[PDB]
Structure 1
Amino acid sequence: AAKDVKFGNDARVKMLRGVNVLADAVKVTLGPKGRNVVLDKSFGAPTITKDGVSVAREIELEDKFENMGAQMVKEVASKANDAAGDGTTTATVLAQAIITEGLKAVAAGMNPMDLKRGIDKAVTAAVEELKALSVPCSDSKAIAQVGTISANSDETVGKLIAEAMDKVGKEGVITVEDGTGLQDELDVVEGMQFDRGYLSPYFINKPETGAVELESPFILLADKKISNIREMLPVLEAVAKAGKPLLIIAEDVEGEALATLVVNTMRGIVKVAAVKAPGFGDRRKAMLQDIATLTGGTVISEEIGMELEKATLEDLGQAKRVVINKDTTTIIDGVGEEAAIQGRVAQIRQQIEEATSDYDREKLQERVAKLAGGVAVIKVGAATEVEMKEKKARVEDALHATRAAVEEGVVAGGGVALIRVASKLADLRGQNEDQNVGIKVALRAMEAPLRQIVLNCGEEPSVVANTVKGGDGNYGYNAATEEYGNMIDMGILDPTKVTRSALQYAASVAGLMITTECMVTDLPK
């Protein structure tokens, strides 16, 4: 259709207004003292929340161009979220600060590319600096502490997460489920995990979860593109008569077969979840054989000769519970016999022994690791279902934070790491004047997080920011108690990885955002 186009400073100010609207919408909820925000519901009561992610997913603007700026900040915030799992408000605030300053500089007539280059230099310097300032979290006690603070200061959740972390090692797989008894339970059962996502979002049985949980499902293994709907018809009849959930792992799924499965899920007669084949080529087939071993299933490939039509209920594997996340998938207690799994472990281990390629050897090593380590299973213990699910969600976010911190590290919360980095790197210069201006933009930009936190606390942001700048080390201003002190001593912490990713994504989005001219759109009808 006829598409409008505007470019130059006018488009820049429009997109600036849009991102400003979104930033004002989301920044309020930052911090403990982040104020409540009320969001719509087409029926019934409006919802009340302090979670910025809901605000981001629910916000869009009537004006096209402002809406598009809002979408830029929204998608980069979501990228940060899926990268780490928290701190989305922090990333959005950083983005607003950097982008507002960059636009006002561009209004001053500076060269945009020089500003972008200076920003890139400043942000990479900050990344390496905070990497230096990172503190390892390998010790169990700090893991318990971070899990505690993430779960609204619940020490039991931290203890359980730490124990599970011990059980399955540093890079194990942990899943949480509902426990019947009032006491928490923990058990290591061999399972599987791999990074693949659902074919369509429509498979999500619990939209709030964002994932598909299936109990006692039947798993289909395939190394072929599922061109036609006639291929899986016997399997569909089989799972219809079985009356149980169905999981599919295929090299590819076409739009038509997926759409038919979507129609089937809306029919509710059969609930089908489909995922892509992990790995590539030979390695893909090798872990497909691993899955067949784990579930007692059979691998169906075009090259060997068998097809999906020649599929029986026996041919498919099985397991006790599978979860299909946004881009991950895990399986728990595959029916496949442990002895066959051990034989496969030995085969892959001797393959490692004869391995000469480094990357293939690493693939085999991680394959045996995921195959032998298994999966830890938490079972939430409480009285009523409401607190069952509350504890479940708290455990989920806590373990996400814990694995994030374990992966990279941890620093003092309150954004104090950012301002400390700013004080350290204030002297960093650029090749030319405009690059230096962008450097200064970045250096004064990451004061915004604690500033907005203080604003949500009601105190004057500038005074507290100056006070923190005066202090050194891990000294800052507890928002909850509204008093100064060392965050580490009082348990306030934040993973290094989440802050690093947030800053990187904010810098990247701002760099591409400032350098845009032609904000095209469709005719407003």
Structure 2
Amino acid sequence: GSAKDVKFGADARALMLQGVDLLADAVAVTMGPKGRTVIIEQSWGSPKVTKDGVTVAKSIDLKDKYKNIGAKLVQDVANNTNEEAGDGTTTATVLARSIAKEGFEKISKGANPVEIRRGVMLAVDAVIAELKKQSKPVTTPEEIAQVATISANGDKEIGNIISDAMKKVGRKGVITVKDGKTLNDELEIIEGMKFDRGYISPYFINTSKGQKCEFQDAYVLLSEKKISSIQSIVPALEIANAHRKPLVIIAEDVDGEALSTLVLNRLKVGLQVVAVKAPGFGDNRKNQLKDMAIATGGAVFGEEGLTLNLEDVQPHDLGKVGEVIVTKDDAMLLKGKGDKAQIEKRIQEIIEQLDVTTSEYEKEKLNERLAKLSDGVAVLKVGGTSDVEVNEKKDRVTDALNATRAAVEEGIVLGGGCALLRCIPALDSLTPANEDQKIGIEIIKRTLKIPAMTIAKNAGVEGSLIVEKIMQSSSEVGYDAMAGDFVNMVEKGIIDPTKVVRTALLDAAGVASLLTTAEVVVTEIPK
């Protein structure tokens, strides 16, 4: 319904290329070890300093709508690369700009850009097959540290701390990045079942040094329903007092009558009890209670299908731990006495629940449940003096974690853009179906030198000479742009994940080669 402007052919393609060139020229300055940063103004306060390609891409829009179309398409390239792999967005941006420029140069009257796109995709398939052929799996934690160090702009402390976290909680474990109140980065390992639910009554503290509740070899009473009646808590207290053992009551809530009974028996006769609210909101709360029951060797009272009531409690029905810490903010359970076979069965059930899930919010919850049933979670606290420093370093820590996970799942190739450089003879061994497919294959072949050229150009040297000397060298030798040397890349640690490289190439090609099929561009007339 709105009035439209319509452009045809080379003028529209030139304007779209100007937009692509602006966004890629702003992104490409951040590539490699000698890459620089981009300052983006935020409308609500302090500006953001970043070295992340998708962050620079997403934060650029142009007043010219023909240039903004190309900007949005390269934004789609960088965002798809960020979603699929979590790293390699700058590489994807420069590859997409190169494919778009070389495809725009090759459009003539007799050219068929759709067949050029077909040739581009065939060449990308060949290059991805070569990348999977030349990849090797990660088998040492030193390779993990090298991947996390390269992906964090040569920061060996971030690589070492990610390697330590992955040593402790496992290669497929849960690691969460957050900010820190200290100048230095730190790694905290949370083992057992720790959840962020504190006390219900402050009077339950029996360790005034840390203002916390401390028991050893304690009974555990787990309730799916909120414990309200006094008759629902008297037999459990009777068991816990007749056996002379502490009692941790984890429930949905505890009302005033049961709280008054617990606090009276704590402050008057000296009963070792503590009440903790059940973590979670909804079905995940019930799943976490079942996990705690299996880990502690108890049964959950208040079942909505089994109807287990709190008035007939047996000593075998109660779970057992060998240490519990209850703080005002959180509570943890240590060395639960649950049966190992049932714990393994619950772990297998969680793993099989992970196979059918697509919401990507239930997967995180299930992974957290699996981690709490296993060696635990790792928290990386990122240090700095200001919020802008912490955000800039946290983007790099997230990049290193994503690249390390991709290297774990799919292996490693040579870093520095040399992996794409070693795939050129696999395009030289290709027979095109026609001239347009040949044009597309040559477009991809010329594009395969772009990441190494950009990394060398950011280092202040002539990238074409560097790429020529890499291609004249052996297959193990590439260019260390940090030292400015020609080195064995595996022995020097410059390595990339295979997944990141192929994700960047595929996501750049699929959009740029479709952008180079256009003849007419329709925009709205600006108001």
Q: CA deviation at 1:420?
A: 0.9
Q: CA deviation at 1:485?
A: 2.0
Q: CA deviation at 1:446?
A: 1.6
State the partner residue of 2:492: 490
CA contact (8 A) 1:348 1:368 kept: no
Q: CA deviation at 1:180?
A: 8.1
Separation in structure 2 between the aligned mates of residue 393 and residue 320 of structure 1, nearest angstrom: 33
Deviations 1:375-426 (A, max 9, x none): 3224559897888888766544332221121111112211011111113322
Equivalent position SS for 1:414: coil
Give 1:476's match in structure 2, choosing from 460, 478, 481: 478
Q: CA deviation at 1:435?
A: 0.9
State the partner residue of 1:309: none
The residue identity in structure 2 corresponding to 1:404 is: A
State the partner residue of 1:293: 290
State the partner residue of 2:231: none
State the partner residue of 1:325: none
Separation in structure 2 between the aligned mates of residue 454 and residue 116 of structure 1, nearest angstrom: 29
State the partner residue of 1:127: 128
Is 1:143–2:144 an aligned residue pair?
yes
Give 2:505's match in structure 1, choosing from 503, 506, 524: 503
State the partner residue of 1:117: 118
Comparing 5-14 and 480-489, the one that deviates more: 5-14
Comparing 71-80 and 476-485, the one that deviates more: 476-485
State the partner residue of 2:2: 2
Q: Residues 149 and 352 (structure 1 numbering): CA distance in 2 closer, same or farther, change over 3 Å?
A: closer
Separation in structure 1 between the aligned mates of residue 57 and residue 74 of structure 2, nearest angstrom: 9
Give 1:514's match in structure 2, choosing from 508, 513, 516: 516
State the partner residue of 1:163: 164
Give 2:426's match in structure 1, choosing from 393, 404, 424: 424
1:266-345 aligned at under 5 Å gives the runs: 289-294=286-291, 345=343
CA contact (8 A) 1:217 1:247 kept: no
Separation in structure 1 between the aligned mates of residue 4 and residue 450 of structure 2, nearest angstrom: 35
Equivalent position SS for 1:489: helix
State the partner residue of 2:175: 174
CA contact (8 A) 1:416 1:450 kept: yes
The residue identity in structure 2 corresponding to 1:417 is: A
Q: Residues 341 and 190 (structure 1 numbering): CA distance in 2 closer, same or farther, change over 3 Å?
A: farther
Task: Give aligned-pair identity as a percent.
Answer: 40
State the partner residue of 2:264: none
Comparing 405-414 and 45-54, the one that deviates more: 45-54
Root mean square deviation of aligned Cα: 4.6
Q: Residues 136 and 435 (structure 1 numbering): CA distance in 2 closer, same or farther, change over 3 Å?
A: same
Separation in structure 2 between the aligned mates of residue 320 and residue 435 of structure 1, nearest angstrom: 67
Q: How many residues align?
A: 417
Comparing 125-134 and 102-111, the one that deviates more: 102-111
Separation in structure 2 between the aligned mates of residue 447 and residue 134 of structure 1, nearest angstrom: 19
CA contact (8 A) 1:293 1:341 kept: no
Separation in structure 1 between the aligned mates of residue 386 and residue 491 of structure 2, nearest angstrom: 35
Q: CA deviation at 1:470?
A: 0.9
State the partner residue of 1:72: 73
Separation in structure 1 between the aligned mates of residue 196 and residue 5 of structure 2, nearest angstrom: 51
Q: Residues 3 and 498 (structure 1 numbering): CA distance in 2 closer, same or farther, change over 3 Å?
A: farther
Deviations 1:155-189 (A, max 9, x none): 44433322332333332222345678989554242
The residue identity in structure 2 corresponding to 1:407 is: E
Separation in structure 1 between the aligned mates of residue 285 and residue 3 of structure 2, nearest angstrom: 47
Q: CA deviation at 1:301?
A: 13
State the partner residue of 2:373: 372
CA contact (8 A) 1:187 1:378 kept: yes
Q: CA deviation at 1:432?
A: 1.5
Equivalent position SS for 1:14: helix
State the partner residue of 2:83: 82
State the partner residue of 2:108: 107
Equivalent position SS for 2:478: strand
1:206-217 aligned at under 5 Å gives the runs: 216=197
CA contact (8 A) 1:345 1:371 kept: no
Separation in structure 2 between the aligned mates of residue 419 and residue 486 of structure 1, nearest angstrom: 15
The residue identity in structure 1 corresponding to 2:76 is: E
Structure 2 stretches lacking a partner, 5+ long: 200-251, 256-277, 294-299, 307-324, 357-362
Equivalent position SS for 1:402: helix
Q: Residues 411 and 174 (structure 1 numbering): CA distance in 2 closer, same or farther, change over 3 Å?
A: same
Structure 1 stretches lacking a partner, 5+ long: 193-213, 219-234, 239-245, 251-284, 305-318, 322-331
State the partner residue of 1:410: 412
Separation in structure 1 between the aligned mates of residue 348 and residue 399 of structure 2, nearest angstrom: 39
CA contact (8 A) 1:215 1:320 kept: no
CA contact (8 A) 2:470 2:477 kept: yes
State the partner residue of 1:204: none
Q: Residues 505 and 152 (structure 1 numbering): CA distance in 2 closer, same or farther, change over 3 Å?
A: closer
Q: Residues 183 and 42 (structure 1 numbering): CA distance in 2 closer, same or farther, change over 3 Å?
A: closer
Deviations 1:64-116 (A, max 9, x none): 12112101101220110232222211100000001111122223542122111
Q: CA deviation at 1:498?
A: 0.8
Q: CA deviation at 1:335?
A: 7.6
Q: Residues 418 and 183 (structure 1 numbering): CA distance in 2 closer, same or farther, change over 3 Å?
A: closer
The residue identity in structure 2 corresponding to 1:442 is: I
Q: Max radius of gyration: which structure?
A: 2
